[PDB]
Amino acid sequence: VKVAYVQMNPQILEPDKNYSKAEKLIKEASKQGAQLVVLPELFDTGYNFETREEVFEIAQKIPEGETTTFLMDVARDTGVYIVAGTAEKDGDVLYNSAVVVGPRGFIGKYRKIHLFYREKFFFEPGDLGFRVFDLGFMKVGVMICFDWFFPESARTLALKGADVIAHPANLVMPYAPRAMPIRALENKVYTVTADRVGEERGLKFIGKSLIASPKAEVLSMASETEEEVGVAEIDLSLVRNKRINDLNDIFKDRREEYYFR
Amino acid sequence: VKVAYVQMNPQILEPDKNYSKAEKLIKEASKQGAQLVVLPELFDTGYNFETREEVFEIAQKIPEGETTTFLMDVARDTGVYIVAGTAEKDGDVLYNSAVVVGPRGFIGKYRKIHLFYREKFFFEPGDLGFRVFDLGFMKVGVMICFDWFFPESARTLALKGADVIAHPANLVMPYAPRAMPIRALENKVYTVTADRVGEERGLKFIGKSLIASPKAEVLSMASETEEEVGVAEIDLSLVRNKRINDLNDIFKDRREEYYFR
Ligand SMILES: [Br-]
Ligand SMILES: [Br-]
Ligand SMILES: [Br-]
Ligand SMILES: [Br-]
Ligand SMILES: [Br-]
Ligand SMILES: [Br-]
Ligand SMILES: [Br-]
Ligand SMILES: [Br-]
Ligand SMILES: [Br-]
Ligand SMILES: [Br-]
Ligand SMILES: [Br-]
Ligand SMILES: [Mg+2]
C-alpha cells in the first residue's frame, strides 16, 4: 500500500492559488502510486494571521465549502484518499482541521486538539477527539502539527487501530522530524507528516515532511523549503500485529493502572 | 547540580564483584562532582539468567539485603545519591528493581513495571507504580530499561514532578538512545539512562548510556562497550517550568479527555 505527503507553500489568504498548487501535487503523488495523500496544516488559508477576520472571512465549511469540494473533485479524479489541513469555518467559530476525502467523496475530519501558540487567538481547540478512518484497505489516524508533541496523540490513534498516522503540519520548531520516528516506533504505526514550507509574514516553517516506519525508519523526508511530494510503500501486517518479540506485545504490555492521567 | 550515569558490566551471579566495580565507578562519578549517580538494571546479579533459581538464590532483600546495604555505605562515604538496578527478593517473589539511597540511608525502590522478554520467566511485573523520590534538592523519577518504550512511563514520572528520570537499563534494542532525547523533550525533564555493557551468555547489551536534556540535547553519551561514568550539569529551573513559549505549557496544554479513548 502506498502513502504520500504533499509538501507545499500555502499562500496566505489565497485559496484558489493553494487549490491549484495542491491539485498539481496530489496528482503527482497519485501518479506515483499513492493511495493516501496527506497535505499540510491549513493548506488553503495559510497560517500566520494577525486577525481572526482575515482568516474567518475566507475559511470554508466542511464538507460543503470550497476546500473540501475541491479535494473531493481531486480525489474523485485521481482515485486517491486525501488528508488535508484546512481552516474550518463552523458557524461563528474556526477550527484548525484536517479533512479526509476519498474517490467516493467526504470521509471525515479531525480538529486539532492541541493548539499551538497564536492559533489560540483564532481557532477553537479541537473537539472531535483523535479519530481513525477506515478506508477498507487501511485505517488512517489523523493528528495535526503540535499534536506530535504529546505522545498521547499518536498513542490514542494507534490504540484505535490506526495503521497510518496522517499528520498535516506547519512546523516552526525543529523537533518534530526527530520525534515522529519515535511516535511510529512506540506505537508500531506508520506516520506521514506533511509539512508546509515558506515564509509567511516573517514566520518561517521547517519543511521536512516525512514518512516514518514502525521501526523508527525514515522512509521519506522532504526538503526544508521546496514544494514536493514523497511516497512510501507500507506493510500493513507489520503495524497490525503489535508483538515486538515472542514475549512482548506493545498493546498487551501496557499497564494503564500505572499511567498518570 | 550534576547528575551521572555509571555504565558498567555486571558479571552474572557475582554480586561481590559487581559491588566492588560499582563502588569504584560511583566514587569516580562523585569525584567528577556528581550528586546523583545512576547505575544499570540488575547491576548486582547481571541479566541473562538460564533459570529463575540462579537469580533467586542470590537476589537480595531491599533495603536490608547486601545490595542496598553496600550502596548505602557507598552513598555515605562518597556523599552521593544513587539509583541502581538490583534483583529484589521479597519473600518468594523476585522483582526487577531499582534502589534509591543517599548519604543518610535508604530512600526507596522502584519495581520494573514493563517486563521485557525472558524477565517474564523470573520476575514479577512491578507493583509500586512510577515513583518520584524527593531528595530535597531535586526530584528523581525512576524507570527501568524497557519502561522507556512506553511513553507513559516517562510521562507519569514527569507529571509526578521528576526533575530527572534516573533510568537503569540493560538495552538490547537499538532504539532507546534515540528515543530518550524525545522522552526528555516531550516531558521537559532530564533523563539519565545508565545502561550496562557486556555480552552475557550470548545477549549483547548496547551501552550508549546517556543524559538527555529537556531540549532533546544529548548532554553525555557513553560508549557501546566500555565501563565509564558520564556527568552533566542540569538546570533545574528549566524543567520545573513547563512553558515551551509564553502561550504553551506542556502540562497545561495536555487535553486528557481526548487521550486513549
Ligand atoms: Br487566490
Ligand atoms: Br503503485
Ligand atoms: Br471514499
Ligand atoms: Br466528519
Ligand atoms: Br475513531
Ligand atoms: Br502516552
Ligand atoms: Br572492581
Ligand atoms: Br539521604
Ligand atoms: Br520503598
Ligand atoms: Br530489535
Ligand atoms: Br553539562
Ligand atoms: Mg488538560
XYZ file of C-alpha atoms and ligand atoms in Angstrom:
534
model
C 0.000 0.000 0.000
C 1.371 3.456 -0.836
C 1.156 6.626 1.173
C 2.327 10.157 0.406
C 2.798 13.611 1.748
C 2.323 16.799 -0.145
C 4.720 19.471 0.998
C 3.616 22.843 -0.374
C 3.772 26.642 0.310
C 0.326 27.824 1.184
C -0.041 31.470 0.044
C -1.890 33.127 2.971
C -5.485 34.265 2.196
C -5.221 32.908 -1.326
C -7.178 29.651 -1.511
C -7.679 29.411 -5.316
C -3.864 29.607 -5.587
C -3.486 26.927 -2.958
C -6.086 24.648 -4.644
C -4.235 24.835 -7.918
C -0.957 24.049 -6.134
C -2.447 21.209 -4.066
C -4.150 19.705 -7.133
C -0.844 19.609 -9.020
C 0.906 17.911 -6.135
C -1.854 15.415 -5.204
C -1.884 14.451 -8.913
C 1.843 13.994 -8.611
C 1.532 11.735 -5.578
C -1.251 9.819 -7.378
C 0.869 9.249 -10.477
C 3.479 7.682 -8.164
C 1.018 5.164 -6.892
C -0.088 6.760 -3.600
C -3.492 5.690 -2.421
C -3.297 8.043 0.558
C -2.016 11.613 0.136
C -1.591 13.984 3.102
C -1.341 17.794 2.747
C -0.110 20.420 5.185
C -1.950 22.018 8.051
C -4.152 24.931 6.856
C -3.032 24.382 3.280
C -5.839 26.545 1.838
C -5.618 29.663 4.001
C -2.063 29.734 5.232
C -1.051 30.124 8.819
C 0.327 33.362 10.163
C -2.729 35.522 10.637
C -2.841 38.850 12.524
C -6.584 38.982 12.898
C -9.277 36.418 13.061
C -11.280 38.463 10.491
C -8.977 37.880 7.604
C -8.975 34.086 8.087
C -12.616 33.809 9.089
C -13.696 35.843 6.033
C -12.316 33.176 3.734
C -12.456 29.988 5.753
C -14.612 27.236 4.325
C -17.286 24.978 5.805
C -16.709 21.201 5.821
C -17.757 19.256 3.812
C -19.805 21.595 1.659
C -17.361 24.515 1.309
C -14.782 25.121 -1.440
C -11.794 23.392 0.110
C -13.486 20.010 0.742
C -15.339 20.041 -2.582
C -12.147 20.828 -4.372
C -10.401 17.964 -2.543
C -13.293 15.628 -3.353
C -13.030 16.653 -7.013
C -9.364 15.832 -6.937
C -9.883 12.522 -5.008
C -12.668 11.603 -7.418
C -10.489 12.384 -10.412
C -7.287 10.737 -9.179
C -8.718 7.817 -7.165
C -6.694 8.705 -4.034
C -7.682 9.344 -0.481
C -6.573 12.731 0.843
C -5.955 14.037 4.320
C -5.573 17.846 4.262
C -5.212 20.655 6.756
C -7.864 23.305 6.357
C -9.193 26.283 8.181
C -12.662 25.057 9.025
C -15.448 27.562 9.294
C -18.062 26.145 11.552
C -20.815 28.652 12.274
C -19.169 31.561 14.043
C -16.174 29.522 15.033
C -12.966 28.422 13.251
C -11.104 25.137 13.691
C -7.696 24.117 12.583
C -8.882 20.984 10.872
C -7.950 18.075 8.622
C -10.413 16.752 6.084
C -10.245 13.189 4.887
C -11.704 12.553 1.441
C -11.711 9.625 -0.955
C -12.892 8.924 -4.523
C -16.462 8.495 -3.223
C -16.391 11.896 -1.573
C -16.105 13.094 2.014
C -14.880 10.609 4.625
C -14.353 12.674 7.722
C -12.482 15.436 9.522
C -10.297 15.856 12.598
C -9.941 19.176 14.576
C -6.501 19.945 16.084
C -6.675 19.022 19.710
C -3.514 20.810 20.822
C -3.493 24.327 19.513
C -0.147 25.921 19.159
C 0.945 29.399 20.129
C -1.109 32.122 18.425
C -3.558 29.591 16.941
C -5.191 30.020 20.278
C -6.101 33.553 19.104
C -8.008 32.337 16.016
C -9.078 28.740 16.360
C -11.190 26.808 18.757
C -9.428 23.822 20.296
C -10.404 20.568 18.579
C -13.417 18.737 19.986
C -13.836 15.596 17.887
C -11.019 13.727 19.580
C -8.435 11.607 17.745
C -10.148 9.680 15.012
C -9.153 6.757 12.907
C -10.798 6.453 9.479
C -11.310 3.009 7.953
C -10.723 3.219 4.228
C -11.133 -0.552 3.944
C -7.657 -1.157 2.637
C -6.286 0.791 5.643
C -7.224 2.590 8.808
C -5.934 6.163 8.839
C -5.388 8.127 12.048
C -5.150 11.915 11.827
C -3.431 14.481 14.004
C -2.192 17.936 13.165
C 1.188 19.700 13.616
C 1.595 20.335 17.582
C -0.279 17.103 18.317
C 3.102 15.327 17.629
C 4.476 16.886 20.826
C 2.089 14.987 23.115
C 2.847 11.214 22.794
C -0.791 10.782 23.771
C -1.932 11.916 20.285
C -0.154 9.172 18.368
C -0.894 6.706 21.177
C -4.680 7.356 21.018
C -4.623 6.933 17.220
C -2.550 3.748 17.347
C -4.653 2.271 20.110
C -7.685 2.889 17.939
C -6.187 0.639 15.254
C -4.548 3.269 13.064
C -2.280 1.646 10.541
C -1.030 5.056 9.412
C -0.997 8.379 11.190
C -1.665 11.160 8.735
C -0.124 14.359 10.057
C -0.691 17.685 8.344
C 1.758 20.118 9.905
C 3.138 23.691 9.691
C 6.233 23.081 11.846
C 8.171 26.044 13.208
C 10.296 24.217 15.885
C 12.912 21.715 14.727
C 11.883 18.752 16.892
C 9.060 17.016 15.070
C 11.047 15.314 12.296
C 13.120 13.771 15.090
C 10.162 12.798 17.260
C 7.995 11.316 14.511
C 10.098 8.089 14.152
C 9.672 7.542 17.888
C 5.881 8.061 17.733
C 5.888 5.494 14.854
C 8.110 3.056 16.886
C 6.399 3.333 20.165
C 3.028 2.707 18.537
C 4.241 0.421 15.808
C 2.431 2.591 13.185
C 3.425 4.385 10.074
C 3.414 8.183 10.236
C 3.064 10.618 7.343
C 3.863 14.157 8.358
C 3.025 16.632 5.626
C 4.719 19.944 6.450
C 4.404 23.162 4.633
C 7.360 25.266 3.535
C 7.797 29.019 3.137
C 7.933 32.305 4.985
C 4.691 33.902 5.948
C 4.576 37.407 7.473
C 8.038 36.853 8.875
C 7.396 33.306 10.101
C 9.407 30.518 8.564
C 8.298 26.905 8.500
C 10.538 23.882 8.667
C 9.707 21.795 5.559
C 10.993 18.277 6.342
C 7.707 16.436 5.727
C 8.418 12.830 6.453
C 7.185 9.264 6.433
C 8.259 7.062 9.330
C 8.012 3.313 9.789
C 7.036 1.316 12.870
C 10.734 0.511 13.343
C 11.534 4.262 13.546
C 12.849 4.292 9.993
C 12.543 7.443 7.947
C 11.124 6.101 4.675
C 10.771 9.541 3.117
C 11.831 13.064 4.033
C 11.315 16.311 2.221
C 13.375 19.488 1.895
C 13.234 22.463 4.206
C 11.871 24.921 1.589
C 10.603 23.230 -1.593
C 7.152 22.158 -2.560
C 7.330 18.403 -3.107
C 5.700 15.017 -2.739
C 7.106 11.870 -1.153
C 5.704 8.335 -1.283
C 6.429 5.156 0.653
C 5.277 1.610 0.423
C 3.981 0.480 3.749
C 3.403 -3.019 5.058
C 0.152 -3.224 6.938
C 0.724 -6.554 8.688
C 3.749 -5.023 10.428
C 1.597 -2.408 12.105
C -1.409 -4.626 12.740
C 0.358 -7.082 14.898
C 1.778 -5.351 17.992
C 4.205 -8.134 19.013
C 7.813 -6.961 19.111
C 9.201 -10.339 20.141
C 7.610 -13.671 21.064
C 7.106 -12.481 24.667
C 6.098 -8.806 24.291
C 3.136 -7.151 22.606
C 3.181 -3.372 22.998
C -0.504 -3.060 23.500
C -0.889 -6.153 25.700
C 2.114 -5.000 27.771
C 0.695 -1.576 28.558
C -0.286 -1.374 32.247
C -2.590 1.614 32.436
C -3.206 1.378 36.212
C 0.255 2.939 36.472
C -0.046 5.724 33.910
C -0.866 9.131 35.370
C -3.860 10.711 33.528
C 23.797 20.253 40.168
C 25.486 17.428 38.315
C 23.991 14.007 37.648
C 25.843 10.992 36.379
C 25.420 7.516 34.980
C 27.700 4.571 35.791
C 27.910 2.375 32.789
C 29.306 -0.978 33.907
C 29.473 -4.632 33.015
C 27.637 -6.728 35.677
C 29.151 -10.201 35.936
C 26.266 -12.584 36.097
C 25.670 -14.186 39.527
C 28.656 -12.302 41.128
C 27.238 -9.511 43.412
C 30.531 -9.060 45.282
C 32.425 -8.402 42.035
C 29.663 -6.035 40.977
C 29.747 -4.197 44.306
C 33.454 -3.600 44.028
C 33.089 -2.423 40.414
C 30.111 -0.231 41.278
C 31.959 1.300 44.200
C 34.945 2.143 42.048
C 32.756 3.881 39.449
C 30.441 5.684 41.874
C 33.480 7.246 43.527
C 34.625 8.283 40.026
C 31.230 9.858 39.383
C 31.388 11.591 42.746
C 34.942 12.949 42.215
C 33.632 14.393 38.975
C 31.125 16.295 41.085
C 28.006 14.153 40.617
C 25.425 14.453 43.295
C 23.152 11.869 41.674
C 24.572 8.673 40.274
C 22.598 6.122 38.238
C 23.618 2.510 37.773
C 22.295 -0.108 35.282
C 19.450 -2.544 35.531
C 20.354 -5.584 37.698
C 23.919 -4.296 38.227
C 24.420 -6.763 41.107
C 23.076 -10.025 39.574
C 23.531 -9.487 35.843
C 20.635 -10.167 33.491
C 20.599 -13.187 31.256
C 19.601 -15.975 33.632
C 19.274 -19.563 32.393
C 16.879 -20.349 35.226
C 14.946 -18.448 37.906
C 16.828 -20.460 40.523
C 20.202 -18.920 39.758
C 18.949 -15.388 40.376
C 16.590 -16.307 43.176
C 19.459 -17.858 45.130
C 21.488 -14.610 45.143
C 18.805 -11.897 44.960
C 18.905 -9.541 47.947
C 16.092 -8.102 50.039
C 15.574 -4.397 49.847
C 16.568 -2.488 51.960
C 18.083 -4.956 54.431
C 19.950 -7.023 51.790
C 23.590 -6.668 50.748
C 22.990 -4.636 47.615
C 21.167 -1.830 49.388
C 23.494 -2.173 52.298
C 26.543 -1.826 50.106
C 25.008 1.140 48.226
C 24.122 2.891 51.483
C 27.743 2.537 52.553
C 28.996 3.964 49.256
C 26.327 6.796 49.309
C 27.559 7.773 52.760
C 31.318 7.615 52.058
C 31.139 9.423 48.731
C 28.279 11.746 49.629
C 26.157 10.910 46.614
C 22.716 9.757 45.833
C 22.462 6.516 43.981
C 19.832 4.979 41.763
C 20.747 1.365 40.956
C 19.055 -1.652 39.331
C 19.037 -4.760 41.553
C 17.244 -8.120 41.660
C 14.855 -7.863 44.535
C 13.934 -10.840 46.682
C 10.704 -10.211 48.504
C 9.664 -13.458 50.171
C 9.332 -15.987 47.312
C 8.841 -13.367 44.599
C 11.523 -11.656 42.542
C 11.293 -8.127 41.202
C 13.465 -6.364 38.653
C 14.054 -3.323 40.808
C 15.894 -0.050 41.322
C 17.168 1.141 44.745
C 17.473 4.825 45.659
C 19.870 5.545 48.551
C 21.506 8.788 49.633
C 24.283 9.696 52.062
C 21.981 9.320 55.032
C 20.494 5.949 54.053
C 17.803 4.169 52.065
C 15.401 6.369 50.147
C 13.252 3.978 48.149
C 12.816 1.488 45.373
C 11.113 1.101 42.022
C 9.950 -2.230 40.557
C 10.128 -2.599 36.784
C 6.541 -2.189 35.504
C 7.093 -3.388 31.939
C 8.979 -6.644 31.856
C 10.981 -7.498 28.807
C 11.139 -10.855 27.145
C 12.522 -13.634 29.453
C 12.305 -11.349 32.503
C 8.742 -12.567 32.460
C 10.120 -16.042 33.378
C 11.981 -14.787 36.501
C 10.437 -11.618 37.749
C 7.074 -10.457 38.814
C 5.812 -7.338 36.994
C 6.451 -4.339 39.227
C 3.685 -3.238 41.550
C 4.799 0.072 43.180
C 3.966 2.201 40.141
C 6.227 5.007 38.863
C 7.641 6.881 41.847
C 9.437 10.194 42.101
C 11.803 10.495 45.011
C 12.302 13.948 46.536
C 15.941 14.431 47.571
C 15.190 17.940 48.880
C 17.406 19.462 46.205
C 15.679 17.763 43.231
C 13.025 15.203 42.497
C 14.269 11.995 40.938
C 11.946 9.797 38.922
C 12.859 6.192 38.217
C 12.061 3.751 35.477
C 13.963 0.731 34.281
C 15.199 -0.087 30.736
C 12.009 -1.376 28.563
C 9.966 1.095 30.536
C 11.321 3.720 28.094
C 9.371 2.102 25.282
C 6.046 3.168 26.703
C 5.855 6.926 26.544
C 3.550 6.694 29.544
C 6.430 5.672 31.834
C 8.403 8.900 31.415
C 5.200 10.910 31.219
C 3.947 9.570 34.565
C 7.232 10.398 36.288
C 7.403 13.827 34.679
C 3.753 14.539 35.660
C 4.638 13.360 39.165
C 7.258 16.093 39.260
C 10.597 14.497 38.333
C 13.369 16.870 37.599
C 15.403 13.970 36.358
C 14.420 10.479 35.346
C 17.008 8.035 36.505
C 16.770 5.144 34.082
C 18.757 1.978 34.966
C 18.798 -0.048 31.709
C 20.295 -3.152 30.107
C 19.381 -2.150 26.484
C 19.484 -4.785 23.787
C 17.339 -2.977 21.188
C 18.836 -0.111 19.125
C 16.111 2.411 19.820
C 16.487 3.869 23.294
C 19.397 6.307 22.747
C 17.398 7.997 20.005
C 14.165 7.802 21.968
C 15.450 9.165 25.230
C 16.005 12.798 23.994
C 12.435 12.701 22.741
C 11.219 11.467 26.077
C 13.168 14.279 27.777
C 11.712 16.867 25.378
C 8.060 15.794 25.439
C 8.231 15.927 29.219
C 10.704 18.802 29.644
C 12.751 16.638 32.030
C 16.306 15.486 32.065
C 16.874 11.743 31.692
C 19.845 9.725 32.843
C 19.982 6.334 31.183
C 22.538 4.167 32.832
C 22.929 1.235 30.535
C 25.112 -1.730 31.119
C 27.652 -3.057 28.684
C 28.750 -6.635 28.014
C 27.919 -9.851 26.216
C 26.255 -12.048 28.702
C 25.537 -15.685 27.915
C 25.097 -14.573 24.261
C 22.916 -11.476 24.813
C 24.738 -8.281 23.791
C 23.950 -5.030 25.584
C 24.290 -1.782 23.676
C 25.909 0.596 26.207
C 25.289 4.212 24.999
C 24.270 5.427 28.475
C 23.081 8.979 28.041
C 21.887 12.030 29.774
C 19.273 13.893 27.756
C 18.213 17.496 28.266
C 14.694 18.903 28.003
C 15.613 20.454 24.645
C 16.345 16.916 23.390
C 20.143 17.569 23.502
C 22.383 14.698 24.408
C 24.451 16.115 27.265
C 26.573 12.979 27.791
C 26.616 9.683 25.919
C 28.701 6.681 26.798
C 30.464 4.159 24.570
C 28.855 0.952 23.297
C 31.334 -1.347 25.107
C 33.159 0.370 27.971
C 32.508 0.801 31.606
C 32.500 4.503 32.403
C 30.786 7.404 34.077
C 29.226 10.384 32.455
C 28.320 13.551 34.246
C 26.319 16.565 33.149
C 25.086 19.774 34.830
C 21.317 20.033 34.830
C 19.304 23.258 35.010
C 16.543 22.519 37.445
C 14.705 25.783 36.591
C 14.462 24.663 33.023
C 12.487 21.530 33.811
C 10.373 22.880 36.635
C 8.868 25.397 34.212
C 6.741 23.541 31.630
C 6.366 26.609 29.395
C 7.636 25.976 25.900
C 6.797 29.549 24.894
C 4.548 32.089 26.639
C 1.329 30.653 25.139
C 2.119 26.969 25.609
C 2.887 24.994 28.726
C 3.297 21.317 28.119
C 1.279 20.130 31.113
C -1.304 22.920 30.934
C -1.805 22.013 27.278
C -2.463 18.267 27.688
C -6.073 17.542 26.828
C -6.580 14.349 28.783
C -10.285 13.975 27.966
C -9.099 13.038 24.438
C -6.426 10.581 25.380
C -6.601 6.820 24.955
C -10.345 6.989 24.112
Br -6.308 33.048 -4.849
Br 1.743 1.559 -7.028
Br -14.395 7.348 -0.327
Br -16.819 14.289 9.878
Br -12.056 6.585 15.646
Br 1.259 8.393 26.150
Br 36.460 -3.957 40.849
Br 19.861 10.549 52.157
Br 10.475 1.560 49.402
Br 15.461 -5.001 17.870
Br 26.600 19.523 31.122
Mg -5.615 19.443 30.276
